[PDB]
Design a protein around this nucleic acid. Structure first.
Ligand SMILES: Nc1nc2c(ncn2[C@@H]2O[C@H](COP(=O)(O)OP(=O)(O)CP(=O)(O)O)[C@@H](O)[C@H]2O)c(=O)[nH]1
Lengths: 313, 136, 37, 132, 95, 23, 126
RNA sequence: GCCCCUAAGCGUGUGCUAAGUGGAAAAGGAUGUGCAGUCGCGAAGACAACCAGGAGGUUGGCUUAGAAGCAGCCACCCUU
């Protein structure tokens, strides 16, 4: 429902300048052509109206759509509050479309999102849980898709994407390795990143780099030339090759807000042992006479909990 | 969706919504059918909605039989126009369902799941309906 | 409280009752506390 | 009070015992070394004990033997149990020897019926999912 | 076996048939190689009972007027809306 | 739509036998 | 009880009633499985104690042909119906009322032909 | 049309409604109530209720630091 209003608003805002002439031209041409569009309905509906024609009607529907999009932002803030309050470490996956942006999120975690071959299909951001291989959990978000000279009426349809980009720690621009000029996508994606960090002033987040579809690539560089951006990980989502290296380096590059301490716990208070073993990601220990030499990257709630039962060894 | 490939006459009169059905009042292809108890013009979009709901509830097994076909064209005068100056262009495809006619049939091994799928499809239709079974 | 024209059981422990001329789903879980209009 | 099946290991076992005994009150060393004295005769499988705490220092030891549910597992050479119980059977054991060596474990079974207690043991084995 | 009881019809037509159906009496015709159409009004709900118990391919006893005649149902007539038995065709059977 | 709805329900009456002028 | 399944157990208990030698109509209240199984293994096959539905067993003991102890089926009757012995197999059976404090024997009638409120403290005990 | 306004029944005989329904309304929701069925259980005591037991192999196994009926998996057995 959100998309069927944003797309319609974008089409109305693109067609409003060009009403006379062209607009009446597709008013005359009503067969469901390429310009026939359809709005968010897709299966015509307002497709028989295409982008509408009347400026009065366009203006009215535009005002209603503005109000509705206003509502579906105080909906989205509510839906994201739980993540915000818990401050789970968020990782987002951006890049050019058809660059394995959804296959990666179906690969690292068994999400199961649509992976159609065509262009922009994951048009609504979806996020899924995940565990960094060694320690902390995380959340993973795949975005919509970027294009060279992106339309200027689609920024609202991309607004939720932009919000996910800003509210992130590790940004991931996935580049389609087996494609001509694997850098043209990169410059456009980066430029989108700068306009985002400018429109919403924030410290830019680290940008993790991954080259995808290198299984079918003919090595366009086949060398440090293939290291056209030398910092990157060459994953193959179709085969799951760099998953281990990606799953390792992505966590190591997210930064840890833990608190590694060494604490001992007398057996009576096994509650603390269980809480460290289920919340804190203990490295290891030896099972001591009365307690344990637990070396756990314990978090803030339990940091002061385990301060009393500390140890010096 | 569903559409006739060719129609002899594109602009027709309105289908007659009178009398109970005379043919198609029985489950003949499946095991559970959705009979109709009211008169309705059931459009192709409603048929696709019901079909998708049925095919997504069971989601694996059994066939779905859509007896009716939306071949009658319904026209629509263009907006903000005064009355007159010819009949409008075709806009809707309808099937002139009649009470007693079975609109959908289904055959799934699990009986209650099929019953619930038919219930979940009845909600997409503009009229009353009931679950009818091949075992009379 | 969920004032909807359609009130249904949602979980295994929802009971539908007629109280003061109104249909209510009373459940141990407060999230399922639904009252018909 | 606790029918804990303390492991047969006579080489440094409290941590495993220390939790289960520090949630209550019993001498850790006394309990450990008395169970270790029992294991001096019981090195097969760690025999079970029911420590009967009343208010302090229960000092009670009764034997119920360790992997009865898998005495068959222990006395076949096959380990890891069976992670696919009845999906496919895992391992091979002898059908006569279960009926025979059910004698040792019949000391705490339900009934004295021979073939039926053998079926008890066959049930505990087939719980893994294995042929016997 | 099925032991149905049948009665002949004194009035035929639309009005009489609806009146018979209003009193739980499904009208029926007895015909076959007997070469004589017998207009019968069969009491209802027991016709339905035997049809559900055995099926259409059954053998109705049909004690008409104290005279037994074995028959088999050949053609029914259910209303599409109010599923009932509007009329049943009975084929004569001679032993 | 209250006014027209009332003026149309007015026909459903014993004395009017279910049909009124301008119904 | 179970209209079809009832008669099978009624007949089984009845035939064991007429086959046996005596009766002790007893109270099984509060019998935790431990002590109850200790009893089942103490008397063993002889007097094989197994509770049966009192309402049905009234007709079951009559199915065997005998009456009597049927009079006092009020409460949760428990039956042993000793197989071979009379005195030596009833000592512990009666004295479980002293040891476990359970199995107070209402009794009332021996073998189906001899009434006695002393059903246990009779020859069965002495 | 017949309780008063307002002429004539606060009629008689059987039932139903608690909503002022009567004295506006839909998809749909619903332990409202009556009537006619059918099917299951049950005086060998059913259903509710109260008093007891509710066992052992056993903590079934895998799993995990740990999962012992009750993270979660397979089986979903053996005896009394
Ligand atoms: N051969 C091969 N194909 C891949 C690889 N990674 C992704 N693809 C292909 O990319 C295609 C596009 O699917 P998707 O994963 O959605 O790419 P995308 O970038 O997310 C397209 P969108 O942005 O609209 O979600 C898929 O058909 C998938 O098969 C890879 O490593 N090797």
């Amino acid at each position: 429902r959100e998309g069927k209003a944003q797309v319609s608003l974008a089409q109305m805002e693109y067609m409003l300048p060009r009403l006379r002439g062209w607009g009446e031209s597709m008013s005359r041409q009503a067969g469901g052509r390429a310009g026939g569009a359809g709005g968010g309905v897709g299966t015509r509906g307002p497709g028989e109206t295409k982008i509408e024609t009347d400026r009065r009607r366009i203006r009215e529907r535009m005002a209603k759509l503005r109000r509705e999009i206003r509502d579906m932002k105080k909906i989205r803030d509510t839906q994201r509050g739980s993540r915000r309050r818990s401050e789970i470490p968020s990782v987002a996956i951006v890049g050019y479309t058809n660059a394995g942006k959804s296959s990666l999120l179906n690969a690292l975690t068994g999400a199961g999102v649509l992976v159609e071959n065509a262009l922009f299909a994951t048009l609504e951001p979806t996020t899924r849980r995940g565990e960094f291989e060694d320690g902390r959990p995380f959340v993973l978000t795949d975005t919509v898709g970027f294009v060279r000279h992106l339309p200027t009426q689609l920024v609202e349809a991309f607004r939720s994407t932009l919000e996910e980009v800003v509210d992130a720690d590790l940004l991931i621009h996935v580049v389609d390795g087996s494609d001509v000029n694997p850098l043209a996508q990169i410059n456009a994606v980066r430029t989108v990143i700068n306009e985002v960090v400018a429109e919403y002033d924030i410290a830019p987040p680290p940008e993790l780099l991954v080259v995808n579809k290198i299984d079918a690539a003919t090595g366009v560089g086949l060398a440090q030339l293939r290291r056209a951006l030398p910092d990157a990980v060459f994953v193959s989502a179709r085969t799951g090759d760099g998953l281990d290296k990606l799953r390792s380096r992505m966590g190591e590059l997210v930064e840890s807000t833990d608190a590694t301490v060494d604490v001992t716990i007398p057996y009576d208070r096994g509650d603390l042992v269980a809480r460290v073993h289920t919340d804190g990601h203990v490295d290891a220990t030896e099972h001591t006479d009365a307690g344990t030499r637990i070396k756990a990257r314990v978090p803030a709630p339990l940091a002061a909990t385990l301060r009393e039962y500390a140890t010096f060894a | 969706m569903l559409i006739p490939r060719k129609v002899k006459h594109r602009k027709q009169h309105h289908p007659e919504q009178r009398g109970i059905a005379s043919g198609g009042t029985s489950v003949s292809f499946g095991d559970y059918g959705i009979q109709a108890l009211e008169h309705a013009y059931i459009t192709n979009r409603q048929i696709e909605s019901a079909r998708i709901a049925i095919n997504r509830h069971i989601k694996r097994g059994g066939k779905v039989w859509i007896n009716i076909f939306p071949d009658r064209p319904l026209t629509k005068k263009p907006a903000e126009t005064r009355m007159g100056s010819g009949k409008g262009s075709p806009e809707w495809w309808v099937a002139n369902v009649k009470p007693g006619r079975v609109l959908f049939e289904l055959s799934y091994p699990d009986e209650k799941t099929a019953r619930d799928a038919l219930t979940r499809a009845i909600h997409k239709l503009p009229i009353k309906a009931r679950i009818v079974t091949r075992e009379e | 409280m969920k004032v909807n024209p359609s009130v249904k059981p949602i979980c295994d422990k929802c009971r539908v009752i007629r109280r003061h001329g109104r249909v209510m789903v009373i459940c141990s879980d407060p999230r399922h506390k639904q009252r018909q209009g | 009070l606790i029918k804990l099946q303390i492991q047969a290991g006579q080489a440094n076992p409290a941590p495993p015992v220390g939790p289960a005994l520090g949630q209550h009150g019993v001498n850790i060393m006394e309990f450990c070394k008395a169970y270790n004295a029992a294991t001096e005769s019981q090195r097969g499988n760690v025999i079970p004990v029911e420590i009967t705490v009343y208010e302090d220092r229960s000092f009670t030891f009764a034997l119920k033997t360790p992997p009865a549910a898998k005495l068959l597992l222990k006395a076949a050479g096959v380990q890891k149990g069976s992670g696919e119980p009845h999906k496919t059977k895992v391992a091979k054991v002898t059908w006569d020897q279960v009926r025979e060596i059910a004698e040792t474990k019949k000391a705490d079974l339900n009934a004295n019926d021979i073939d039926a207690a053998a079926k008890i043991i066959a049930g505990t084995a087939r719980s893994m999912g294995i042929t016997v | 076996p099925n032991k149905l009881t049948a009665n002949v019809r004194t009035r035929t037509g639309k009005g009489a048939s609806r009146q018979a159906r209003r009193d739980g009496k499904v009208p029926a015709v007895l015909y076959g190689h007997g070469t004589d159409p017998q207009h019968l009004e069969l009491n209802a709900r027991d016709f339905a009972a035997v049809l559900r118990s055995h099926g259409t391919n059954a053998i109705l006893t049909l004690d008409i007027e104290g005279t037994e005649q074995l028959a088999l149902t050949k053609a029914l007539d259910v209303h599409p809306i109010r599923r009932n038995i509007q009329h049943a065709d009975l084929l004569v059977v001679q032993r | 739509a209250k006014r027209g709805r009332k003026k149309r329900d007015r026909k459903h009456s014993k004395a009017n036998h279910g049909k009124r002028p301008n119904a | 009880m179970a209209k079809a399944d009832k008669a099978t157990a009624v007949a089984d208990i009845a035939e064991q009633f007429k086959a046996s030698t005596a009766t002790v109509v007893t109270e099984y209240r509060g019998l935790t499985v431990a002590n109850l199984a200790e009893l089942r293994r103490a008397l063993g096959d002889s007097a094989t104690y197994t509770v049966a539905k009192n309402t049905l067993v009234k007709r079951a003991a009559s199915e065997a042909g005998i009456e009597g102890l049927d009079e006092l089926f009020a409460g949760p009757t428990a039956i042993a119906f000793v197989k071979g012995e009379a005195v030596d197999a009833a000592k512990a059976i009666k004295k479980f009322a002293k040891d476990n404090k359970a199995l107070v024997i209402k009794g009332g009638y021996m073998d189906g032909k001899a009434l006695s409120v002393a059903d246990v403290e009779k020859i069965a005990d002495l």
